[PDB]
Design a protein around this nucleic acid. Structure first.
Ligand code: MG
Ligand code: MG
Ligand code: MG
Ligand code: MG
Ligand code: MG
Ligand code: MG
Ligand code: MG
Ligand code: MG
Ligand code: MG
Ligand code: MG
Ligand code: MG
Ligand code: MG
Ligand code: MG
Ligand code: MG
Ligand code: MG
Ligand code: MG
Ligand code: MG
Ligand code: MG
Ligand code: MG
Ligand code: MG
Ligand code: MG
Ligand code: MG
Ligand code: MG
Ligand code: MG
Ligand code: MG
Ligand code: MG
Ligand code: MG
Ligand code: MG
Ligand code: MG
Ligand code: MG
Ligand code: MG
Ligand code: MG
Ligand code: MG
Ligand code: MG
Ligand code: MG
Ligand code: MG
Ligand code: MG
Ligand code: MG
Ligand code: MG
Ligand code: MG
Ligand code: MG
Ligand code: MG
Ligand code: MG
Ligand code: MG
Ligand code: MG
Ligand code: MG
Ligand code: MG
Ligand code: MG
Ligand code: MG
Ligand code: MG
Lengths: 48, 62, 183, 52, 109
RNA sequence: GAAAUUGUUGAAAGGGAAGGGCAUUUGAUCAGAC
RNA sequence: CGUGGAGGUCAGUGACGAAGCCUAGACCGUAAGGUCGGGUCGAACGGCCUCUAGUGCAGAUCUUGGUGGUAGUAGCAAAUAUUCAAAUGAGAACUUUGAAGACUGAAGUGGGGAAAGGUUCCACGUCAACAGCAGUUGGACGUGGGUUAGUCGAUCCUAAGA
RNA sequence: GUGAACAGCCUCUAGUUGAUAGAAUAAUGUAGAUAAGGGAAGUCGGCAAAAUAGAUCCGUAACUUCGGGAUAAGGAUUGGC
């Protein structure tokens, strides 16, 4: 059935686009981490 | 010819580990018909499927 | 339809195009420029040899940090590769365009690739995972490839000289003199 | 409408997170979280001198 | 031209596997053996016989033998024309020790 | 169906950036003319 | 000078192409901008006299969306290890079988369960996306099937407690 | 099976052979190693590494809350038949 596979052809290709919008609209702040603590700390060196 | 099913069956039917089972490589077409625990039991008695011998551990040294 | 820029007579040329191919864009752009301008059967026999590591594809634009190779020498470049997957999709097209040239009843021996162009198709997107719990885009760079093969004609030799001679009253009289001198 | 653009919980992240000071939507796991909020210049935020 | 031969070569693995990473030795035997047999009889498509494969491995990935004595035949390819008309086939030959023997052409009947 | 950005063709230039101002040569190109 | 709307007016322009966009093509203006030509395009839109304002952007670590250089680069290196034939297939380093070599070595990489999950179980069909290589394979995708109690649990009893 | 041992190392029953591959083997690496003579001269500091180690027999001080210290320190033996 060509009628058949043309249709699950479209849907897949439509769907897959709409999961792209999601990874992009999310993308900007996805790395937002309140309360992130840097593993690395550097002593500020000065003598009073 | 994907035999991963029939090899899992034979193991249960012949009452032994998968690793001791042996499927005749020339009957591959044949075995592919199995698909049922009953079918398999023909194939065991028939001889086209076989139980390999336990690998030998001798105590003779000890 | 609606191909890229064409200098070709449409009746004597056959064309084929794939779209949304899963291949590097940067890599295909490289294998494209390679076989551009060549005679068709040359192109194919050559692409064959690249699969074998006999010849190579010179990387002339996106080369950065590519390795040096001997095989580069042929085209006078030190940076070259053998992009297998690119080559497949180009072979696949060249085989096709050669078939369309057949059902158009053109002469196969006189064919050569006139115009071959590849631009970038919409990115596709997965995620990857980075230290300190971050996320990054991890992306395919699909391509559209189009190619037009032509039947070679050296048959054009045209003489067009358009003479509008603007001469002053002085230059006319002065050409006159030279004619009275029996030159 | 006077509620407009104010329907949100947004706060400022304060400085130190390397981005503009403008109050952003807290929360997570949606497109909208983190985005700019209120402000007259922000998508979705309140307009300047709302018509009364 | 290429005519349908059979010979019996000894190959020295020990000089060919010299200094190789232990875990990869058995496999380099198999690329070596292939390479060797494409040298002589330039057939370019080779196939090992599974028992030759045991003959290599019989000692485990480290301990490959110093000398093998193999029988290499050059045969006609079939069907589905491969990019070559000709074909190479290796299988081992049982012997006491592979020492001291030289290449012999096997008469074929 | 704009822009960034990108491919092909075409034209041009290029000795550690490019771009701008004043003036003209060279090439391309175009209005007024009656 | 420019923009969204409003009253008036040119019995203004328009499917014989309105607006929009494109144009190292032309003209007007000191300039804000205005006007014509060509290409695209397909339904509405301008001049003038006045009214009104959510009315002009290069910047705000501005806001939302989009895209580069970087760059075919960094990388894909813990847990010892794969190899040969055949079948399948358009296609086989990676699927299935045989052979071989190996490892977990009973405080297991084995057989069962608790919390949690929720159909992942199992067959048939399938390869667009997913399995940071591949893919004929799959905890993926499509169509179905499957969980049987007088005795195993809950149910009943009380504990610290509510 | 070794062994005091549920330690480490090898196998049997069951289970995996899944962790992107190929070709070469430069620098610098990461992990693992060995070094003549000297023996801490290195460094803020013996940090890191080396030495020692099991069992049996001998021998075992100062001090002490008399229980310890103590495996003190220091020696000798170890296979096969
Ligand atoms: Mg942005
Ligand atoms: Mg590099
Ligand atoms: Mg460089
Ligand atoms: Mg990562
Ligand atoms: Mg985490
Ligand atoms: Mg609003
Ligand atoms: Mg070495
Ligand atoms: Mg459109
Ligand atoms: Mg552009
Ligand atoms: Mg106006
Ligand atoms: Mg308004
Ligand atoms: Mg128009
Ligand atoms: Mg322009
Ligand atoms: Mg405003
Ligand atoms: Mg604006
Ligand atoms: Mg702006
Ligand atoms: Mg400003
Ligand atoms: Mg900014
Ligand atoms: Mg980027
Ligand atoms: Mg790299
Ligand atoms: Mg990976
Ligand atoms: Mg790494
Ligand atoms: Mg590993
Ligand atoms: Mg593997
Ligand atoms: Mg082991
Ligand atoms: Mg269970
Ligand atoms: Mg399953
Ligand atoms: Mg299946
Ligand atoms: Mg993949
Ligand atoms: Mg794939
Ligand atoms: Mg499912
Ligand atoms: Mg009853
Ligand atoms: Mg009960
Ligand atoms: Mg014992
Ligand atoms: Mg033990
Ligand atoms: Mg181990
Ligand atoms: Mg398991
Ligand atoms: Mg596997
Ligand atoms: Mg890994
Ligand atoms: Mg080299
Ligand atoms: Mg020393
Ligand atoms: Mg010494
Ligand atoms: Mg000393
Ligand atoms: Mg010192
Ligand atoms: Mg010192
Ligand atoms: Mg210190
Ligand atoms: Mg120390
Ligand atoms: Mg003491
Ligand atoms: Mg002692
Ligand atoms: Mg003794």
């Amino acid at each position: 059935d060509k009628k058949g596979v043309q249709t699950q052809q479209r849907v897949w290709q439509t769907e897959r686009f709409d999961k792209k919008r999601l990874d992009k609209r999310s993308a900007k702040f996805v790395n937002n981490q309140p309360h992130y603590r840097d593993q690395l700390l550097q002593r500020e060196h000065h003598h009073h | 010819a994907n035999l991963r099913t029939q090899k899992r069956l034979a193991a249960s039917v012949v009452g032994v580990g998968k690793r001791k089972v042996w499927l005749d490589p020339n009957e591959t077409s044949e075995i592919a018909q199995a698909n049922s625990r009953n079918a398999i039991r023909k194939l065991v008695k028939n001889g086209t499927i076989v139980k390999k011998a336990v690998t030998v551990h001798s105590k003779s040294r000890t | 339809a609606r191909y890229g820029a064409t200098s070709t007579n449409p009746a004597k040329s056959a064309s084929a195009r794939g779209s949304y191919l899963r291949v590097s864009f940067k890599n295909t752009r490289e294998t494209a420029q390679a076989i551009n301008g060549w005679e068709l059967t040359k192109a194919q026999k050559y692409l064959e040899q690249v699969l074998d590591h006999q010849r190579a594809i010179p990387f002339r634009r996106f080369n950065s940090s590519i390795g040096r190779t001997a095989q580069g020498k042929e085209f006078g470049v030190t940076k070259a590769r053998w992009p297998a997957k690119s080559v497949k999709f180009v072979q696949g097209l060249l085989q096709n365009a050669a078939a369309n040239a057949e059902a158009k009843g053109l002469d196969a021996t006189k064919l050569y690739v006139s115009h071959i162009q590849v631009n970038q198709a919409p990115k596709q997107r997965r995620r990857t995972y980075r230290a300190h719990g971050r996320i990054n885009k991890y992306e395919s760079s699909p391509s559209h490839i189009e190619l037009v093969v032509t039947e070679k004609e050296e048959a054009v030799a045209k003489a067009a000289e358009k003479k509008v001679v603007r001469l002053t009253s002085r230059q006319r009289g002065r050409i006159a003199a030279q004619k009275r001198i029996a030159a | 409408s006077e509620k407009a653009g104010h329907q949100t919980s947004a706060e400022s992240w304060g400085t130190g997170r390397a981005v503009a000071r403008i109050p952003r939507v807290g929360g997570g796991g949606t497109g909208r979280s983190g985005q700019g909020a209120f402000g007259n210049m922000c998508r979705g935020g309140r307009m300047f001198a709302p018509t009364k | 031209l290429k005519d349908v031969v059979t010979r019996e070569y000894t190959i020295n693995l020990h000089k060919r596997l010299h200094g190789v990473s232990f875990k990869k030795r058995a496999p380099r035997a198999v690329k070596e053996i292939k390479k060797f047999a494409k040298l002589h009889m330039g057939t370019d498509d080779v196939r090992l016989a599974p028992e030759l494969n045991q003959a290599i491995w019989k000692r485990g990935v480290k301990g490959v033998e110093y000398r093998l004595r193999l029988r290499i035949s050059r045969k006609r390819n079939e069907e589905e024309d491969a990019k070559n008309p000709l074909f190479s086939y290796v299988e081992p030959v049982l012997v006491a020790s592979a020492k001291g023997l030289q290449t012999v052409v096997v008469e074929e009947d």
